[PDB]
Amino acid sequence: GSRRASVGSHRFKVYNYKSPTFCEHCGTLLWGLARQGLKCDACGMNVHHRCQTKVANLCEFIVTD
Ligand SMILES: [Zn+2]
Ligand SMILES: [Zn+2]
Numbered sequence: 001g002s003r004r005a006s007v008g009s010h011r012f013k014v015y016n017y018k019s020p021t022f023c024e025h026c027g028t029l030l031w032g033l034a035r036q037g038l039k040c041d042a043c044g045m046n047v048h049h050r051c052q053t054k055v056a057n058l059c060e061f062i063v064t065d
Contacts, residue, residue, distance in 0.1 A: 007058065
């Protein structure tokens with residue numbers, strides 16, 4: 001089946017956003033045409049590069065057997 005996992009760290013990777021997107025740590029716009037911020041590979045959370053180390057929430061995602 002599947003489980004709702006909740007883990008201690010995100011897996012952030014630089015991402016190229018295609019529409020105006022806001023930082024899920026600080027709230028403000030991820031500015032630019034490209035490389036505007038980091039998307040978590042596991043849950044999709046978007047943050048600024050400069051906000052990465054400040055992120056304090058759990059990373060939640062569905063795991064399917
Ligand atoms: Zn995450
Ligand atoms: Zn931010």
